[PDB]
Symmetry: C3
Subunit: 134 residues, 3 copies
């Protein structure tokens, strides 16, 4: 049937700040295009090597979003006001969505903690597994 | 057949300490209620934004448990005795269990590192995918 | 059919350094032995409790590799030159591979950041879910 495994990956994104959730370019799954219109998707946003730069306990919020908006989110933050070096802080987020609710796409998004610039310069992925009771 | 994707999520838990693994309230999957009695479950415990508070290199242990007890565990810990700010330390744990062994539920659990108080104040999830050779 | 859930887990590995990706002993899935020769695998490398020791902002790179080499990688790093204590830095990596390309096994691998010694002394896992459009 429909291939039940969906995936998108990137190796970089332009460095930005944001006060709201904004798409991480390339982390996008087109569910409607796949003909998936019911059942559930287990979605994993994997950003294994991010870093944040800023002047006030930097960090990044990440979200899984659909056309209906944010379904789940989280963040990492450093434990010092201005880290001596902004270390790489692995981040994974997992959510399960009902496609029947009207889901046509899934995206990874990010937002600044305290004005931080947001850095991806290596592999990151957005994955989904489709399940049905049919 | 049985919907092969199971999930539970929370956005907070009462702040506690524990010297043993104790349930994270709400992170519970009822496998027996779903009629799943054989095959395997790939379980993901996702706690993307925890923090620990304490006086001695704080942290949190997390576990995946069934009615048979802990199947897998791990922790995060800070790298300073008393962090200047207790940053958010994303945590994910993945284990695969044989349901045929007698599994009726799956839970997320947590335990203090060195007496730490344990904090969830945003999204966290427990997910499972059922697979069968049938 | 073929059990669509594959998993391997360990609780320790000999402490090593490496300037290249080297196998994490025991984190190995034999895909060919399972008779899986097409479709896709969603692979998760879960190293929830590693630490790195070294003198120069320590860390560990991790990779998912097949017989064809590295498909995805990432790292954690500390935010201090010589951490007061090398805290536990949870790490997860997720990649989806096309088995049809000629994949016969999947492995977790690791490599030093800046000469770090690499430590696993508790649970770690390598998991895969097989999906087919057939
Ligand atoms: C901001 C600093 O960034 C440094 N890493 C790199 O400059 C870099 C460039 C490419 C990569 C990288 C990562 C993960 C997988 C792969 N293959 C490559 O890392 C860190 O070592 C410091 O600790 C610190 O966080
Ligand atoms: C203990 C401190 O906690 C602060 N965060 C919050 O007080 C907070 C309240 C709600 C949330 C939060 C998280 C993740 C997703 C969402 N949507 C919301 O965070 C951090 O900024 C500091 O770095 C530090 O760890
Ligand atoms: C290097 C130091 O390592 C300490 N942990 C241990 O020595 C240890 C030995 C077994 C385990 C361990 C872990 C995860 C799950 C389980 N069950 C057991 O941890 C940390 O507390 C410090 O913060 C610090 O990182």
């Amino acid at each position: 049937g429909h291939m039940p495994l969906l995936s998108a990956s990137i190796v970089s994104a332009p460095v930005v700040t944001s006060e709201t959730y904004v798409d991480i370019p390339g982390l996008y799954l087109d569910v409607a295009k796949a003909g998936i219109r019911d059942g559930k998707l287990q979605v994993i946003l994997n950003v294994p090597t991010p870093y944040a730069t800023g002047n006030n306990f930097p960090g990044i919020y990440f979200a899984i979003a659909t056309n209906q908006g944010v379904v789940a989110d989280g963040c990492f933050t450093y434990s010092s006001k201005v880290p001596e070096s902004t270390g790489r802080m692995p981040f994974t987020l997992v959510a399960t969505i009902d496609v029947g609710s009207g889901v046509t796409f899934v995206k990874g998004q990010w937002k600044s903690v305290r004005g931080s610039a947001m850095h991806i310069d290596s592999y990151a992925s957005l994955s989904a597994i489709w399940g049905t009771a049919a």
